[PDB]
Design an enzyme around this catalytic site. Structure first.
Site, short mmCIF file in Angstrom:
data_model
loop_
_atom_site.label_atom_id
_atom_site.label_comp_id
_atom_site.label_asym_id
_atom_site.label_seq_id
_atom_site.Cartn_x
_atom_site.Cartn_y
_atom_site.Cartn_z
N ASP A 8 0.88 -1.15 0.00
CA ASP A 8 0.00 0.00 0.00
C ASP A 8 0.93 1.21 0.00
OD1 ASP A 8 -2.52 1.40 0.21
OD2 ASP A 8 -2.04 1.83 2.30
N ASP A 10 -0.07 5.15 1.02
CA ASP A 10 -0.29 6.04 2.16
C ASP A 10 -0.49 5.29 3.46
OD1 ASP A 10 -0.45 8.55 0.41
OD2 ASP A 10 -2.21 7.46 -0.30
#
Length: 225
Positions: A8, A10
């Site tokens: 991922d 953020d």
């Protein structure tokens, strides 16, 4: 065998959401509307993944000024601000991230991002944190509107795996959020979770490892077990 590691963006590569919140608020201010997202409200708004989607949800329920521009236009303006903010600040990668990526590269392991964040957001992070364009760090970038159904839907991870041409048994995901964990798991991936500021309150039942810091992996070794 670990053929690929998926990340991922953020909350996983770097702690960025507070900067995103700033970019949203400075955008609303710039437009002259009375909207303001404080930390508490933003924590709730983050359960809606996707920048445009988050803006949309807020505008469906809020009782302040009406939207002066469409959702996409607001998000574009916010994106420009976030990109500027990333360029000026001193955003660091989360602990362990830099070392893991270097180890993986040396080992011939492919890297991918699978994220609801937009491509300009990924590029901004890579330039600021790696000193290189994203395509020079990540073999595969699965981001934003490249899929219709956002996390917790596994679609973004399925896309990433398809582009990588790597089946889930030879891959592993690093995530920071419940929606992220659910998305990785729906794509059949083992998932290592370490929450960030905005998701420390969540529960991560079913995570293959749950860590305070990705540094606790001790690099590639921690991904095998």
């Amino acid at each position: 065998m670990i053929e690929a590691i998926l990340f991922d963006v953020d909350g996983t590569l770097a702690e960025t959401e507070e900067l995103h919140r700033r970019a949203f608020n400075e955008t609303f201010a710039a437009l002259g509307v009375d909207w303001f997202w404080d930390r508490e409200e933003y924590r709730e708004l983050l359960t809606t993944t996707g920048g445009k989607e988050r803006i949309a949800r807020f505008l469906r329920h809020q009782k302040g000024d009406p939207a002066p521009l469409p959702i996409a236009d607001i998000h574009r303006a916010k994106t420009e601000r976030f990109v500027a903010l990333m360029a000026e600040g001193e955003i660091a990668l989360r602990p362990g991230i830099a070392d893991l990526i270097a180890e993986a590269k040396r080992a011939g392991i492919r890297l991918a991002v699978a994220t609801t964040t937009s491509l300009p957001n990924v590029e901004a992070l890579c330039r600021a944190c790696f000193g290189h364009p994203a395509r020079e760090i990540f073999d595969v970038i699965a981001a934003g509107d490249m899929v219709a159904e956002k996390k917790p839907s596994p679609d973004i991870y399925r896309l990433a795996l398809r582009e990588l041409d790597v089946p889930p048994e030879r891959a592993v995901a690093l995530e920071d959020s419940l929606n992220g964990l659910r998305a990785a798991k729906g794509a059949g991936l083992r998932c290592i979770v370490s929450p960030g500021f905005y998701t420390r309150h969540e529960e991560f039942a079913g995570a293959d490892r749950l860590l305070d810091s990705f540094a606790e992996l001790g690099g590639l070794a921690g991904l095998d077990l």
